Amino acid sequence: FDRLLNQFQSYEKHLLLAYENFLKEIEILNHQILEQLKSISERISSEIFASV
Amino acid sequence: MKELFQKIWQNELQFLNFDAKFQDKSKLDTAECAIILSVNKDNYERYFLLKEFQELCKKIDLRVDIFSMQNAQICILNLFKSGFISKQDLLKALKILEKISKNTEIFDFILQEKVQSIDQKALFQNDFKELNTINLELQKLDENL
Amino acid sequence: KIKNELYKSFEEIKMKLKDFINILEREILLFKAEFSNIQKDHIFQSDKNFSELRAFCNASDEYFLKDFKELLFKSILELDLFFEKLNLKAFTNYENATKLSLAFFSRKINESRVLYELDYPKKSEIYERVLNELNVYEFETLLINKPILTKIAKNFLEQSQNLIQEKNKFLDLKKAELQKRRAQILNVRESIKEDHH
Amino acid sequence: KIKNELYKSFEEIKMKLKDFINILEREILLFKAEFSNIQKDHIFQSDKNFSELRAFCNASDEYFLKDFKELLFKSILELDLFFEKLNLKAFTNYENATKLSLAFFSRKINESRVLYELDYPKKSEIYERVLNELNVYEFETLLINK
């Protein structure tokens, strides 16, 4: 039973370790999606301007 | 080799990690390895009830459970590949054991398998000069010794 | 191409969560495999004890694994729904955003025209209008102010930690059971060893 | 109100599937409860046999229940995604549909107007345009054809 408990705690610690990089990547993706949206909007605004 | 273990442990095959986590590599000799490999799912109850087999497994530091038997077989086969302890002599021993266990599957797998780098005499010289270095260190630190 | 990039990113996040679950799963199933079959060595070792241990470790999938899987499934569902929202409001309705903002600017232009008293579009205004049409205030809030993906991940981590704690307590029950027997044995031993009295 | 009605209907379908799973689950778990503890009666019965039975029925959750739950969850996911599609293309974008078809008809009217030289909206056309804006071909296909 002690072995099982230690395995659980090891899994917890591994999760805590990996979440550093994981959360940073997710933040990066947030910003990426936002800037992709803004780029699309820039293109559409340019082409709306073109047809004035 | 999960297909092999499916062949020889048809329904009783367990969720197990295919690698030799063997901690000694000299835990058992080749005849004992052949006996452990000949514990095919059709002989396993008889083997576990055999007093001699229980003695053997206690000598090797095994249980007589299904899972430990399969894990030991995995480790034996990976040593057969990586540390390369067995020869066709292991196949000899399995052919000898075929008196009891007609274990053709593991026999063929051991036969038809890329064996490994062999490396014997270089390893011999390495170990011998390791022991020479240890002897020199002991000499450093008494005259009788 | 942008949409496909984001889709692949979402799949990547889902795969990471799944991989965490798979790690834990493999460990737990190896435990089950070993101790569903552990057999007693020599007589006097309480066959019933070992039998009960084997049964418990056999059901240890139920005991230790399926809750984590359910949590993973919930997180995957939330991720998929968020991606669907982003797709259907932004990366598919760009045509509709174009038409709406374009017609709006046309009507504004004609409104300017109809001032025939001699008494028109800037690009920044067009950009802001297209941004609003693409729902970029809403997605700004969901991506920066209240990050949805980040919240999903943190929920996964926190709930998995709570699950681990629950499992720990559950196993402590078994250990207390063992402690009872152990204390009984120690009482007997101390009684035997202190009978020179 | 229409949107809330449809949401409730989707929830109802999900609940029916969940209830099916619960039926099966309750039966399976009662089986586990009984036969994880069945003990032998008489001297000559195989204690090991009964022990193995107890372990097997104990693991019977794993054996008989979890796949069904996974299937249920997948179905629920699909249902929720479909409802979200219906919501975001139709029952929230009615304002946008109105604006688009309205501006289109306005521009068509003015196009008709600028044909001067001593040379307009019918309701059927407006209905068809608003129908197309609400994606009702797509949702007709998804609700009737497929």
Numbering used by the authors:
A (entry chain C): 305 to 356
B (entry chain A): 1 to 141, 144 to 147
C (entry chain C): 408 to 526, 534 to 611
D (entry chain D): 408 to 526, 534 to 560
Provide passages from the article that reported this PDB entry.
Here we structurally and biochemically characterise the DLP pair from Campylobacter jejuni. The respective proteins, here called Cj-DLP1 (84.5 kDa) and Cj-DLP2 (71.2 kDa), were cloned, expressed and purified. Both DLPs are monomeric in solution and form a stable heterotypic tetramer, termed Cj-DLP1/2tetramer, with 2:2 stoichiometry when mixed. The tetramer is dominated by a 2-fold symmetry where Cj-DLP2 with its symmetry mate (termed Cj-DLP2α and Cj-DLP2β) form a central back-to-back cis dimer flanked on each side by Cj-DLP1 (termed Cj-DLP1α and Cj-DLP1β). Combined with GTPase activity and lipid binding, we present a mechanism for how the tetramer tethers and bridges distantly opposing membranes.
Crystals of Cj-DLP1/2tetramer were obtained in the apo state and the structure solved. As observed in solution, the asymmetric unit of Cj-DLP1/2tetramer comprises a heterotypic tetramer in 2:2 ratio. Both Cj-DLP1 and Cj-DLP2 have a core DLP-like fold with GTPase, neck and trunk domains. The N-terminal 16 amino acids of Cj-DLP2 form helix 1 (Cj-DLP2H1), which inserts into a groove within Cj-DLP1AD. Here, Cj-DLP2H1 is partially clamped by Cj-DLP1 G-domain helix 18 and terminates in close proximity to Cj-DLP1 hinge 2, meaning it is ideally positioned to modulate Cj-DLP1 conformation upon binding. Connection between the Cj-DLP2H1/Cj-DLP1AD complex and the bulk of Cj-DLP2 is therefore via a 9 amino acid random coil linker only (termed Cj-DLP2linker). Such architecture suggests that Cj-DLP2linker represents a flexible tether in which Cj-DLP1α and Cj-DLP1β will be free to explore, in a mode akin to restricted Brownian motion, a spectrum of positions and orientations relative to the central Cj-DLP2 dimer. Hinge 1 acts as a fulcrum with the trunks of Cj-DLP1α and Cj-DLP1β assuming significantly different conformations relative to each other. Cj-DLP1α forms an open linear conformation, whereas the Cj-DLP1β trunk is rotated in plane ~125° towards the neck C-terminus. While the trunk orientation is likely determined by crystal geometry here, the conformational variability reflects the flexibility of the hinge 1 neck-trunk interface.
